[PDB]
Amino acid sequence: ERPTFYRQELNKTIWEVPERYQNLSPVGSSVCAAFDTKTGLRVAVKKLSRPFQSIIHAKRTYRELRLLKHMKHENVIGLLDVFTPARSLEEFNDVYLVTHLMGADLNNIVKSQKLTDDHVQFLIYQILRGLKYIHSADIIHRDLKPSNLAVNEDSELKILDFGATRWYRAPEIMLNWMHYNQTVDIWSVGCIMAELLTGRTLFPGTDHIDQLKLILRLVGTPGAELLKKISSESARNYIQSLTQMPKMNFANVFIGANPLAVDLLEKMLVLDSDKRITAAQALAHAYFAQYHDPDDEPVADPYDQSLESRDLLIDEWKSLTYDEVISFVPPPL
Numbered sequence: 251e252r253p254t255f256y257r258q259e260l261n262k263t264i265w266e267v268p269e270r271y272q273n274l275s276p277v278g279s280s281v282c283a284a285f286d287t288k289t290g291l292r293v294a295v296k297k298l299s300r301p302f303q304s305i306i307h308a309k310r311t312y313r314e315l316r317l318l319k320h321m322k323h324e325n326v327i328g329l330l331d332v333f334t335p336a337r338s339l340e341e342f343n344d345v346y347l348v349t350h351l352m353g354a355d356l357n358n359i360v361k362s363q364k365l366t367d368d369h370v371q372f373l374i375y376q377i378l379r380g381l382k383y384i385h386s387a388d389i390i391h392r393d394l395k396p397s398n399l400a401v402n403e404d405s406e407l408k409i410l411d412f413g414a415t416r417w418y419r420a421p422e423i424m425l426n427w428m429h430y431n432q433t434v435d436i437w438s439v440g441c442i443m444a445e446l447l448t449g450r451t452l453f454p455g456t457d458h459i460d461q462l463k464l465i466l467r468l469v470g471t472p473g474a475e476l477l478k479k480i481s482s483e484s485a486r487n488y489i490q491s492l493t494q495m496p497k498m499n500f501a502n503v504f505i506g507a508n509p510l511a512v513d514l515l516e517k518m519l520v521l522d523s524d525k526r527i528t529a530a531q532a533l534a535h536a537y538f539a540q541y542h543d544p545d546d547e548p549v550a551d552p553y554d555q556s557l558e559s560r561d562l563l564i565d566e567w568k569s570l571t572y573d574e575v576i577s578f579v580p581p582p583l
């Protein structure tokens with residue numbers, strides 16, 4: 251049957267949600283923390299901002315719903331629910347998404363203090379285990395960072411994406427290179443790990459260029475093999491036109507850390523993205539010895555990007571989104 255909806259005025263706009271969801275309290279630009287009476291779980295509720303106003307809003311709406319509906323893995327965020335006040339397509343004009351409210355992001359847990367190696371082990375293992383899953387579906391996250399990592403009291407971790415942040419980007423995204431592979435997320439993880447171990451930000455750039463200067467200082471300049479892959483001429487000639495920086499030995503940056511952590515850091519933060527360690531490979535590194543289970547590091551059913559890269563009319567994306575809402579099966583809990 252249809253649930254019963256109650257109306258409320260949260261964050262400069264009117265929210266309408268099933269009575270099941272209580273204690274509705276805002277947390278960000280829009281997302282509300284809430285308590286779900288049917289299950290006993292603490293949930294995040296997201297009200298889509300004008301989901302069907304533009305072609306881009308409609309496209310964005312359908313993508314996010316489809317993607318989460320396919321996401322079923324312990325270290326990735328998943329849909330607990332999705333609903334609308336609408337009783338028909340014609341009146342369909344608001345979309346709500348429910349997920350676990352883990353408790354904190356990876357900033358609240360760190361609060362700029364050195365975490366123990368055992369604690370790092372566990373968090374990074376969770377990130378990577380989730381990345382292997384995301385990547386096997388052929389999906390690249392593109393914006394990994396601590397604000398996008400949901401963690402509870404017990405350090406259980408889920409990767410999400412709340413659509414300076416620049417501090418964890420692979421250099422290629424910054425440089426608007428257009429062919430990206432999965433290992434951009436691996437650069438971000440390296441930067442994240444480093445931050446948990448030493449307690450400070452790895453590349454705390456002040457701007458776009460500063461961000462790049464700091465990166466080159468740690469990993470050194472491009473070697474001959476990397477210059478060979480630069481598609482542009484001026485860029486090619488610019489890189490040559492510098493003080494050749496010698497790749498710093500990470501053991502001299504991370505003093506007193508687990509050498510297994512250092513080794514893994516050497517392998518993640520390689521400038522040439524074709525030479526970075528994959529998630530699947532990283533899971534098998536000796537640093538996760540105490541957690542690694544090759545029979546419990548699942549992959550995703552294949553995922554269609556193209557259906558998102560389409561050009562349809564607004565009414566079509568809306569109808570496609572509605573169907574997605576109507577066909578939803580909650581995960582048994």
Ligand SMILES: Cc1ccc(-n2nc(C(C)(C)C)cc2NC(=O)Nc2nccs2)cc1
Binds near residue numbers: 317318
């Ligand atoms: C346009 C668009 C499309 C997809 C996403 N992605 N991608 C992911 C992956 C599965 C981590 C890649 C997760 C999300 N979304 C997400 O976490 N949403 C959330 N809702 C409520 C609390 S957190 C975001 C925006």
Ligand SMILES: CCCCCCCCO[C@@H]1O[C@H](CO)[C@@H](O)[C@H](O)[C@H]1O
Binds near residue numbers: 489521522
């Ligand atoms: C200015 C110094 C920073 C430039 C180094 C970034 C190069 C990243 O590495 C590159 O990633 C590309 C994009 O996915 C791949 O196609 C290339 O094979 C790889 O070399």
